[PDB]
RNA sequence: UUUUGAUCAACGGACCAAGUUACCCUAGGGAUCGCAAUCCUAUUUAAGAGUUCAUAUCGACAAUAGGGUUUAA
């Protein structure tokens, strides 16, 4: 849902000398909102990504003025954010019936002025519909987010046995007895830092920006997880999780977030729970500023223990804001 | 006792005569492609730059098809 498109403005019609007058302005490119299903159409159908607008009509005998040209339109999903090639946000078609002048039609060719014709503007426009979920799930690889989403919903999420798996976020809506549906999306496990875009990087991290709230899975196996070389403590992971989010965007840290303990079934994990209870809250032997929302609940996937309790806490936060 | 006379130029030249008709009439006949000169475009060129985990090409200059313009009552 993060495609890209190129467009070209129509050319200006050439003027008719001997009092004929101005030529028509070139056609303009307006990205037009349509049914949200159109997103698949744009990226997949019409593989050629160049969209061109009709050039302005040339002046005709009897000193007819230009026809102003023929505009071209690009269907887009609702809620999409229109951004420039450099990443500048031109606009977002948040609601339907929303058109944006992404490209400018060529200035109408006027014989009296300096320029007889003028060519239409052309540019690369990035179009992305980063998942605007009610809340987002953020965790390290092998955290269990896919397993956690598997139990709450029936989305058959891909289970990441190894790191760098489940690259594409999977949107799952959680039903409640109150008949309220809350969308939860599971992204792939993130690496430490990633401010330099190491490994996976923060390219997929743009999706969380849209999400109103963040869900932090805390794998107890994560505590001192090998991570290949060094072994990282869970307390360290939380600090790094907060630190890396702040580096990518300050607002991300300020946004509401929740904590989700995972893999507490193991008796050794239960011993760690007291370590998790000890870590944070009371000052620890620290090894940037970090933020603790305190919305942490002890649960285990696979065994499906305590899952129902967490659901209530998530709903309370959503209802609050 | 030898000669001269025309924008008679409608130029084989009436000495000297314009409009108008739906108010009309008669006799009839009828019908009932080229060059150039720039400028746009489209396809094939690509000189170039390019490019970067549901992520890119555009495009000099040409070639070719169209549409204009200057170029001839
Ligand atoms: N003991 C235990 N094992 C679990 C639990 N949750 C997941 N696992 C195991 O850990 C494996 C790793 O996959 P998992 O962490 O679920 O995938 P993911 O959450 O999508 N990983 P990623 O963080 O990269 O997105 C699973 O296939 C499963 O065998 C849990 O609560 N307890
Ligand atoms: Mg005559
Ligand atoms: Mg004669
Ligand atoms: Mg003769
Ligand atoms: Mg009358
Ligand atoms: Mg009368």
A151 lines ligand 1 (CB under 6 A): no
Three-state DSSP state, A64: strand
Q: Where are the beta strands (DSSP E) in A113-240?
A: 122-128, 135-138, 170-174, 182-186, 213-219
> 10 Å Cβ neighbour count for A163?
16
- Which residues from 102-161 of A have any strand B atom under 7 Å from their CB? 109, 116-117, 119-120, 122, 124
A143 lines ligand 1 (CB under 6 A): yes
In total, chain A counts a number of residues equal to 321
Using C1' positions and the CA of A54, the closest nucleotide is: B41
Q: In terms of DSSP H, where are the helices of A15-114?
A: 38-44
Q: A246-267 burial by CB neighbour count: b if 16+ within 10 A, else e?
A: bbbeeebbebebbbbbbbbbee
By the 8 A CB rule, do A128 and A118 touch? Answer: no
By the 8 A CB rule, do A185 and A145 touch? Answer: no
From the Cβ of A16, is strand B under 7 Å away? Answer: yes
From the Cβ of A202, is strand B under 7 Å away? Answer: no
DSSP state of A142: T
Report CA(A309)–C1'(B54) in Å, whole number. 34
Q: Is the dihedral of CA A34, A35, A36, A37 positive or negative?
A: negative
Phi and psi angles of residue A300, each rounded to the nearest 5 degrees, phi first: -135, 130
Question: Which of A105, A107, A133 shows the shortest CA–CA distance to A118?
Answer: A107
Q: Is A251 left (phi over 0), alpha (psi -120 to 50) or beta?
A: alpha
By the 8 A CB rule, do A71 and A86 touch? Answer: no
Question: Which of A258, A264, A291 shows the shortest CA–CA distance to A277?
Answer: A264
Annotated binding site of A for GTP: 139-146, 186-190, 262-265
Question: Which of A239, A310, A321 shows the shortest CA–CA distance to A280?
Answer: A239
Q: In terms of DSSP H, where are the helices of chain A?
A: 38-44, 145-152, 206-210, 234-248, 250-254, 267-278, 307-320
Q: How far apart are CA A209 and CA A184, in angstroms?
A: 14
Rounded alpha-carbon distances, angstroms, from residue A320 to A3, A256, A313, A314: 34, 11, 11, 10
Phi and psi angles of residue A87, each rounded to the nearest 5 degrees, phi first: 100, -5
From the Cβ of A11, is strand B under 7 Å away? Answer: yes
Report CA A27 to chain centroid distance, whole Å. Answer: 31
Specify the DSSP element, H or E, that contains A34.
none
CA-proximal residue: ligand 1, atom 14 (nearest): A144
Three-state DSSP state, A271: helix
Distance between Cα A262 and ligand 1 center (Å): 9
Q: How far apart are CA A90 and CA A101, in angstroms?
A: 9
Q: A64-93 burial by CB neighbour count: b if 16+ within 10 A, else e?
A: ebbbbbbbbebbbbbbbbbbeeeeeebebb
- Resolution (in Å) of the shown entry? 3.6
DSSP state of A78: T
Phi and psi angles of residue A246, each rounded to the nearest 5 degrees, phi first: -65, -40
From the Cβ of A296, is strand B under 7 Å away? Answer: no
By the 8 A CB rule, do A79 and A133 touch? Answer: no
By the 8 A CB rule, do A185 and A136 touch? Answer: yes
Pocket test for ligand 1, best of A137, A141, A143, A144 (most atoms within 8 A of CB): A144
Q: How far apart are CA A295 and CA A14, in angstroms?
A: 66
């Amino acid at each position: 849902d993060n495609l890209r498109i190129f467009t070209k403005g129509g050319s200006g019609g050439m003027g008719y000398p001997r009092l004929g007058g101005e030529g028509g302005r070139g056609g303009d490119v307006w990205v037009v909102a349509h049914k949200n299903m159109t997103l698949k159409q744009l990226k997949n159908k019409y593989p050629q990504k160049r969209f061109v607008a009709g050039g302005g009509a040339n002046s005709r005998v009897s000193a007819l003025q230009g026809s102003k040209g023929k505009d071209c339109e690009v269907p887009a999903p609702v809620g999409i954010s229109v951004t420039d090639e450099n990443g500048q946000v031109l606009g977002e078609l948040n609601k339907e019936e929303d058109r944006v002048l992404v490209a400018k039609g060529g200035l109408g060719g006027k014989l009296h002025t300096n320029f007889l014709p003028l060519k239409g503007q052309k540019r690369i426009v990035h179009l992305d519909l980063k998942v605007i979920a009610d809340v987002g799930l953020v965790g390290f690889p092998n955290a269990g987010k896919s397993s956690l989403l598997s139990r709450v919903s029936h989305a058959t999420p891909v289970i990441a046995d190894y790191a760098f798996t489940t690259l594409r976020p999977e949107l799952g809506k959680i039903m409640y007895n109150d008949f309220k549906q809350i969308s939860v999306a599971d992204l792939p496990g993130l690496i430490e830092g990633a401010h330099m875009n190491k490994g996976m990087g923060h390219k997929f991290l743009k999706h969380l920006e849209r999400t109103r709230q963040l869900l932090f899975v805390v794998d107890i196996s994560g505590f001192q997880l090998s991570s290949v070389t060094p072994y990282r403590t869970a307390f360290e992971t939380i600090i790094l999780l907060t630190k890396e989010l702040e580096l990518y965007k300050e607002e991300l840290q300020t946004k509401p977030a929740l904590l989700a303990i995972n893999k507490m079934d193991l008796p050794d994990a239960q011993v760690k729970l007291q370590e998790l209870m000890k870590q944070l809250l009371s000052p620890e032997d620290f090894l940037e500023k970090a933020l603790e929302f305190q919305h942490i609940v002890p649960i285990s996937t696979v065994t499906g223990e305590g899952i129902a309790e967490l659901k209530s806490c998530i709903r309370k936060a959503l209802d609050e804001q």
